[PDB]
Structure 1
Amino acid sequence: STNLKDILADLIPKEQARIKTFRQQHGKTVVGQITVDMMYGGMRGMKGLVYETSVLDPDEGIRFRGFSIPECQKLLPKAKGGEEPLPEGLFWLLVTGHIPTEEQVSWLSKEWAKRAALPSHVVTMLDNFPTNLHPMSQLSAAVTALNSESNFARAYAQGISRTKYWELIYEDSMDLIAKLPCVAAKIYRNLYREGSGIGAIDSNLDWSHNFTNMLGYTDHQFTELTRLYLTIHSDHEGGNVSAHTSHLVGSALSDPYLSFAAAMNGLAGPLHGLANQEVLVWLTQLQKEVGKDVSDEKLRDYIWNTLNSGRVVPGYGHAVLRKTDPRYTCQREFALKHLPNDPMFKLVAQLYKIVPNVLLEQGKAKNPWPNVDAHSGVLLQYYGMTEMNYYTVLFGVSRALGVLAQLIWSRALGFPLERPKSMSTEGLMKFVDS
């Protein structure tokens, strides 16, 4: 009806049947080869897992259940006075494969509003943490401590049918999504608002709005940016470190809280969730070095120096993507729509033109075009979100949507423990020699 759990109950049998047939006909079909280099090279280009919620196409970028971000911008419900898609509807899409109605999204905002209360042990933990404990650590720790609240963990220990796993996983996932802005906002306030209270959840507000309210912002366009941000960082296929970590830990039947916290520890890594900060730090050094106002000619020579030094241009490139990132494009649209005379944004715009050509000549790049992280920092900074250490928390809150959507499906489809075979160098040499 508007009850997601019932709609999902109807979808699951159909998907189980489809997969069962496909495995019966094509289980033994070879879809790729594993080389020595793939084993040493982090499984690069290895088809490794099934992940239903999103598929990253190298040339066009991300599709959410086969929908592009432009399609999502147009189709997904917006807040009444807003233009930006609500992350609620994105989650509905990832879970159901269907664009929700307005009423479905309204129902979901209300659900998450009612599940958001933190247990007091987690409030205490958060309030006692020192200011020098990184916000991503605080998040992960708190989410792990939330596992006390887990339906799945409790029911599993009492012996529960395999077929009922997804239901408890759904319940925990909805609970975690609900609580995450409260957790995230407590961290922000404890670190940068002298430990002031996060205030009330409003049952008539969407998730992003309750979040920006608890963060202590009121600017309507910041809420709009947050809706966009939370929508587009939500999922990036299954092979990224945070999706894969959530997937792997979850495959051992760790509850959503544990699986998500482990994902956060992966997103905290420099090579996964820190690029936003790296970009902003690089832009700041840029201005410092050549000046806050620059012609396109100087700017072109700086890139070259960067590269000759053997240093990357942050925010350009991607592991699998090979064209401009649609997550970048849509932030650009927001900017030139809402802050086009922003000096930092202008630099971001400038680099868009210049950097691509360079990286080409250099050769080594595969993808000479920008990723999402090239553009997120200047938007956030524009609206007073200046605490760069905190940025990966926003990413984390976003990424819950995609990874938990998929976790529900992994349990509904009965995906088993992920357990590849490892080899040593010595072992792999003898293997090859016979």
Structure 2
Amino acid sequence: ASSTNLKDVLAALIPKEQARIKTFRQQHGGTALGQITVDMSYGGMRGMKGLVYETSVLDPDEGIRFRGFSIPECQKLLPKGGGGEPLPEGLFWLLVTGQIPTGAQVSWLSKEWAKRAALPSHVVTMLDNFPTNLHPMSQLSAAITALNSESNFARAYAEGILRTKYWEMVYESAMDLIAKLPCVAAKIYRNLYRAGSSIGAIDSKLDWSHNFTNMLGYTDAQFTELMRLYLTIHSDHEGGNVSAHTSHLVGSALSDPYLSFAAAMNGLAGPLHGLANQEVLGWLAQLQKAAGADASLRDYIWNTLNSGRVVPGYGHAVLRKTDPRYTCQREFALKHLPGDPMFKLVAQLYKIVPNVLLEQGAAANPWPNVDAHSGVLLQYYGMTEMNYYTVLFGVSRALGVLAQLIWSRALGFPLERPKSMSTDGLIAL
């Protein structure tokens, strides 16, 4: 009897996995996975295997996998609006469940996210009073912190629930959070760039992406398509990234999903992380200020490097090859906006940057990452407020980080608390 419900599905799945991890441990907990060196310690845990994170795994060479699903694979397997790009909704189901959802599953997330999307008055209020020189990311992060008012987990914890049920309240507070995000994100949008206008209402019959674009104010049918791919691809990127790890870390301490996502956002906002979004465009934007020669393009990159700055959108802590998310984006451009002069500059940089980066002999991965290609796409559709780009990244990222958060709690992962050491201490060791 009956119909769709992620939670019932999860209820069936938790005990299995719990079991599976206990036996594995019972036999392998003692197993050495790896060693820790000094350089690793001074180096940002680079190359250290430090966390269990289920939803996605990043391969240095091939790039990210949602189960074991690649981006090309997702593209073909995940349900679509009607109609070429994958619905982040179906992405979400996959991440949570390990399985490819049916259209019918997918429609259910959509409605669910539609039903839950509602903002409390104190939040609307704060957003409406924020100054316009407060960065969109700051605005977003303070809003999500402020939503903690409403945390179902915060409240259940205060009532004393058994630790076993944590995952259930997490899940609710995840689903409500994902639901609200686009509203928050769009409110910021409309306040800063469309002053006096309103975000409008959520239509239960649309997919999350589409409601998002309406709230943003965009009509173009291809924009919507852009949005669906963008929000799916930015999903998740394993557990070690600043944003995800931040969530995992904060969430480990039993801070509710709102506080943990917000902290994640503060991490996403750093230049070496998701703000690279934004930095890309600005650098591109200066480049053109200062149709160029590869040689003048090259002088320009050198001048950055010489100046003690990074080239934004290039390099990666884990990837060692061109990001497939980059390829993914390129391939969208080539289909849709192949004559765009911004696009063409990005295409030409691809010819030059890595070469310059090899020449310099510093970057371990001279190839571009997702950030190098995302803004170009946005600008094209008219969304040219580049200090806002990272917000979009932030909305997508909720998908992966929250899908995991639920599992961490389902699995009972304890407090994240490694040991630190000072230089003198290490010197002594």
TM-score (norm 1): 0.95
- Counterpart for residue 375 of structure 1: 373
Contact 2:55 2:66 in 1 (8 A): yes
- Counterpart for residue 274 of structure 1: 275
Contact 1:95 1:405 in 2 (8 A): yes
String of CA shifts for 1:130-149, please: whole Å, max 9, x gaps. Answer: 11111111111111111111
Contact 1:328 1:374 in 2 (8 A): yes
CA distance in 2, matches of 1:285, 1:355: 16
| Structure 2: gaps spanning 5 or more residues | none
String of CA shifts for 1:141-190, please: whole Å, max 9, x gaps. Answer: 11111111111110111111222111110000000000000000001011
CA distance in 1, matches of 2:420, 2:356: 39
CA distance in 2, matches of 1:287, 1:184: 29
Q: Tell me by how many angstroms 1:294 deviates.
A: 9.3
Contact 2:127 2:187 in 1 (8 A): yes
String of CA shifts for 1:293-329, please: whole Å, max 9, x gaps. Answer: 999xxx3454445445554332111111000101100
String of CA shifts for 1:1-55, please: whole Å, max 9, x gaps. Answer: 5211111111111111111011111101111111122222111111111000111
- Counterpart for residue 239 of structure 1: 240
String of CA shifts for 1:31-85, please: whole Å, max 9, x gaps. Answer: 1111122222111111111000111110011011210000000001110x42110
- Counterpart for residue 358 of structure 2: 360
SS at match of 2:294: coil
SS at match of 1:262: helix
String of CA shifts for 1:84-120, please: whole Å, max 9, x gaps. Answer: 1010011101000001000000011000000001011
> Against the structure 1 CA distance between its residues 150 and 306, is the aligned structure 2 distance closer, same or farther, given a 3 Å change threshold?
closer
CA distance in 2, matches of 1:99, 1:251: 28
Contact 1:127 1:195 in 2 (8 A): no
String of CA shifts for 1:368-396, please: whole Å, max 9, x gaps. Answer: 11100111111011111111111111010
Aligned counterparts, 1:38-187, within 5 A: 38-79=40-81, 81-187=82-188
Contact 1:75 1:99 in 2 (8 A): yes
Q: Tell me by how many angstroms 1:276 deviates.
A: 1.6
Contact 2:313 2:371 in 1 (8 A): yes
Contact 2:183 2:212 in 1 (8 A): yes
> Against the structure 1 CA distance between its residues 381 and 32, is the aligned structure 2 distance closer, same or farther, given a 3 Å change threshold?
same
SS at match of 2:273: helix
Q: Tell me by how many angstroms 1:291 deviates.
A: 4.3
CA distance in 2, matches of 1:154, 1:166: 14
Contact 1:241 1:272 in 2 (8 A): yes
Contact 2:236 2:401 in 1 (8 A): yes
Worse-matched range after superposition: 359-368 or 256-265: 359-368
> Against the structure 1 CA distance between its residues 345 and 133, is the aligned structure 2 distance closer, same or farther, given a 3 Å change threshold?
same
CA distance in 1, matches of 2:264, 2:308: 31
> Against the structure 1 CA distance between its residues 161 and 209, is the aligned structure 2 distance closer, same or farther, given a 3 Å change threshold?
same
CA distance in 2, matches of 1:268, 1:314: 14
Contact 1:147 1:258 in 2 (8 A): yes
Q: 1:20 aligns with which of 22, 26, 34?
A: 22
SS at match of 1:273: coil
> Against the structure 1 CA distance between its residues 301 and 425, is the aligned structure 2 distance closer, same or farther, given a 3 Å change threshold?
closer
Contact 1:275 1:314 in 2 (8 A): yes
SS at match of 2:65: strand
SS at match of 1:88: helix
Q: 1:335 aligns with which of 308, 323, 333?
A: 333
> Against the structure 1 CA distance between its residues 287 and 153, is the aligned structure 2 distance closer, same or farther, given a 3 Å change threshold?
same
SS at match of 1:270: coil
CA distance in 2, matches of 1:85, 1:221: 13
Q: CA RMSD in A?
A: 1.7
CA distance in 2, matches of 1:131, 1:279: 22
Answer yes or no: is 1:433 the counterpart of 2:401: no
CA distance in 1, matches of 2:311, 2:226: 25
Contact 2:282 2:386 in 1 (8 A): no
CA distance in 2, matches of 1:310, 1:241: 22
Contact 1:137 1:265 in 2 (8 A): yes
CA distance in 1, matches of 2:120, 2:362: 50
- Counterpart for residue 189 of structure 1: 190
Worse-matched range after superposition: 278-287 or 221-230: 278-287
Contact 2:278 2:388 in 1 (8 A): no
Contact 1:54 1:62 in 2 (8 A): yes
Alignment length, in residue pairs?
Answer: 427
> Against the structure 1 CA distance between its residues 337 and 32, is the aligned structure 2 distance closer, same or farther, given a 3 Å change threshold?
same
- Counterpart for residue 409 of structure 2: 411
Q: Tell me by how many angstroms 1:339 deviates.
A: 0.5
